[PDB]
Design an enzyme around this catalytic site. Structure first.
Site, PDB file in Angstrom:
ATOM      1  N   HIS A  54       0.800  -1.227   0.000  1.00 13.16           N
ATOM      2  CA  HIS A  54       0.000   0.000   0.000  1.00 13.16           C
ATOM      3  C   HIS A  54       0.835   1.279   0.000  1.00 13.16           C
ATOM      4  O   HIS A  54       0.292   2.377   0.089  1.00 13.16           O
ATOM      5  CB  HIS A  54      -0.902  -0.010   1.241  1.00 13.16           C
ATOM      6  CG  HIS A  54      -2.307   0.444   0.988  1.00 13.16           C
ATOM      7  ND1 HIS A  54      -2.957   0.222  -0.206  1.00 13.16           N
ATOM      8  CD2 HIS A  54      -3.207   1.038   1.806  1.00 13.16           C
ATOM      9  CE1 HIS A  54      -4.200   0.659  -0.112  1.00 13.16           C
ATOM     10  NE2 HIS A  54      -4.379   1.157   1.097  1.00 13.16           N
ATOM     11  N   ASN A 107      -6.534   6.727   4.532  1.00 17.30           N
ATOM     12  CA  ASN A 107      -7.929   7.153   4.403  1.00 17.30           C
ATOM     13  C   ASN A 107      -8.181   8.662   4.387  1.00 17.30           C
ATOM     14  O   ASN A 107      -9.148   9.118   3.789  1.00 17.30           O
ATOM     15  CB  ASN A 107      -8.792   6.512   5.496  1.00 17.30           C
ATOM     16  CG  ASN A 107      -9.664   5.380   4.957  1.00 17.30           C
ATOM     17  OD1 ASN A 107      -9.211   4.242   4.803  1.00 17.30           O
ATOM     18  ND2 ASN A 107     -10.921   5.699   4.646  1.00 17.30           N
ATOM     19  N   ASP A 167      -0.885   1.461  -5.646  1.00 15.34           N
ATOM     20  CA  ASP A 167      -0.826   0.017  -5.804  1.00 15.34           C
ATOM     21  C   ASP A 167      -2.233  -0.355  -6.282  1.00 15.34           C
ATOM     22  O   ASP A 167      -3.206   0.317  -5.945  1.00 15.34           O
ATOM     23  CB  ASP A 167      -0.514  -0.657  -4.461  1.00 15.34           C
ATOM     24  CG  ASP A 167      -1.380  -0.138  -3.325  1.00 15.34           C
ATOM     25  OD1 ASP A 167      -1.391   1.089  -3.090  1.00 15.34           O
ATOM     26  OD2 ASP A 167      -2.037  -0.960  -2.657  1.00 15.34           O
ATOM     27  N   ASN A 170      -8.776   2.228  -0.716  1.00 11.41           N
ATOM     28  CA  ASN A 170      -9.361   3.237   0.164  1.00 11.41           C
ATOM     29  C   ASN A 170      -8.747   4.619  -0.011  1.00 11.41           C
ATOM     30  O   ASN A 170      -9.417   5.633   0.206  1.00 11.41           O
ATOM     31  CB  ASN A 170      -9.210   2.796   1.614  1.00 11.41           C
ATOM     32  CG  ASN A 170      -7.771   2.517   1.982  1.00 11.41           C
ATOM     33  OD1 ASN A 170      -7.105   1.688   1.344  1.00 11.41           O
ATOM     34  ND2 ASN A 170      -7.272   3.203   3.013  1.00 11.41           N
TER      35      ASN A 170
END
Length: 180
Positions: free
Chosen positions: A22, A70, A95, A116
């Site tokens: 991530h 987020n 990613d 997200n």
């Protein structure tokens, strides 16, 4: 041309996340900054860190949020206002679960593919028509929650390719800036 370009690498802060799936956006953003010889610095009117430079004659603004994934778009939005960049001219490297490991793709719009971080940007810019440099990480094994997967490091074999993959992503961004 005259219009500035905001290239954003997504990821999570902290050393524990520096090498996780991530965070590829952070890595790619760091190659780009080094390639330009520009260093990142606090941007207080946004909360993210920025580095400035040129590519294809274009004025460039590279950035990485300092908040968690987020809340990502929450810093990008005001970063775009400070430098007055249109969403269309915002490129974000991430990613991508929907692309196979190492497969790099380009796109302006479309879905978020469960990322997200992409959802907070859309949520912040009020549109999905910002450029994306997608870096495939493949899908999670069934023995692992999708959210957990992205926050774990790459497998031994994958870790060996990550470096060359990010170089290819950085190159993809440069060409994208060149005429995408």
């Amino acid at each position: 041309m005259a219009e500035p370009l905001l290239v954003v690498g997504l990821g999570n802060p902290g050393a524990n996340y520096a090498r996780t799936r991530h965070n590829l956006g952070f890595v790619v953003a760091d190659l780009l900054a080094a390639r330009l010889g520009a260093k990142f610095k606090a941007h207080k009117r946004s909360g993210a860190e920025v580095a400035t430079g040129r590519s294809a004659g274009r004025s460039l603004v590279l950035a990485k949020p300092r908040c968690y994934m987020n809340e990502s778009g929450r810093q990008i939005g005001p970063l775009a206002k400070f430098y007055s960049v249109a969403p269309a001219n915002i490129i974000v490297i991430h990613d991508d679960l929907d692309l196979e490991f190492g497969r790099i793709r380009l796109k302006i719009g479309g879905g978020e593919g469960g990322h997200n971080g992409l959802r907070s940007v859309v949520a912040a810019l009020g549109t999905k028509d910002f450029q994306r440099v997608r870096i495939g990480i493949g899908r999670p094994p069934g023995r692992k929650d999708p959210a957990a997967f992205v926050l774990e490091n790459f497998t031994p074999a994958e870790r060996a390719e990550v470096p060359t993959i990010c170089e290819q992503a950085a190159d993809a961004t440069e060409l994208l800036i060149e005429q995408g």
